[PDB]
Amino acid sequence: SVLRPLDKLPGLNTATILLVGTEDALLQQLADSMLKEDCASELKVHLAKSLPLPSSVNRPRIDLIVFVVNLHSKYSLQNTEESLRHVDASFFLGKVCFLATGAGRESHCSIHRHTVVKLAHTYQSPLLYCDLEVEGFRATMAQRLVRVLQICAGHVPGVSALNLLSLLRSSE
Amino acid sequence: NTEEELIRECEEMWKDMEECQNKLSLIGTETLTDSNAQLSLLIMQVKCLTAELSQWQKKLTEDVLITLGKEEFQKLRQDLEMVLSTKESKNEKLKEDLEREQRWLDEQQQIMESLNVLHSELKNKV
Amino acid sequence: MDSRIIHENIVEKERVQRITQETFGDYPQPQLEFAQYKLETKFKSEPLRCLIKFSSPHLLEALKSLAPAGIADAPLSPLLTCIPNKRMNYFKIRD
């Protein structure tokens, strides 16, 4: 089931986020950091291990896609590229983002960061580096994700997803 | 009042949104692999850019104005204190930096006269 | 508990935890510290001869947590689920 950003209608001032990865505990902690504070708009969090997403007739709009990647394991990579085949190209227009964890510890980074940099640059998608283990870094990434959600969801008048993509674009 | 008209217009644009949603849904979504993803995404992005450019090219009562004005004066009065406090903090910061600059200038001065007199003494000796 | 979060694939999580609990059990597993399998099986991908050693200060617990951590499949292979059952610690496998 290929996911589409333009399937249904969203709720009244409602925003949704999707997190796809392997480490369930890290996803739960990241969602806890997400919902530590709530803005004016209500927020829904979805966590999944792989794509295509399980079928559900009651699925609301998923306005943001975030893939967590650990440089500690190639298994998370293979998961990401296998899951990437179950989403349309329209999500790639600023509705998709990549968050790499553990990049600071160069000794613990199994795969080289050049690989994920090339992967992100190939699809022209934003790339973010953070460490979920550290509480401060996790919190900072928490307001970062909340506010990028606010930008992409259309809550603030003036910009869209393609606008922020042209903002967050890398030179090469 | 104006609120009822705003609600009616909101319902109208909700109807327009539903119309657009059911209009767009009759398209095969997409399918891309690694090799041809880049060109496809570039084409989709340029199409969306042209569409939104064309769309943007196509594009009350006194009580609400008064209430919003009162709100904005309250916001300005309640947030100017941060910028002021920054203004003092930078004032004393610049004063301290200026004093340090005169200190360094003074020290390098006698450094210069000492170096010049040493150079002249060595030149005269040889 | 924080109903705003809507976990997806929850059926997979509830199936894997149930299978792990049924295979291992609530009781504290016996404190076993060393395992070693000597295998010789056909490649199917001249048999390949493999030799693995599992070292752990507390086995049967990290193995218990592999499935919840998602490292292994929900049903573990019989070569690891019968350590207290078969009363066997060293194995040999042929094609």
């Binding site: 009244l12 | - | 292979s77 496998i93 042929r94 094609d95």
Partner: peptide
């Protein structure tokens, strides 16, 4: 049809709520 609540119903709700295969490996080895 879980009665798609009308916008009006959902709106008031939010406003009000601001107070709360086990046989295939034993056959191969």
């Amino acid at each position: 049809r879980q009665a798609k609540k009308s916008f009006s119903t959902l709106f008031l709700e939010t406003v009000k709520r601001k107070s709360e295969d086990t046989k295939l490996i034993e056959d191969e080895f």
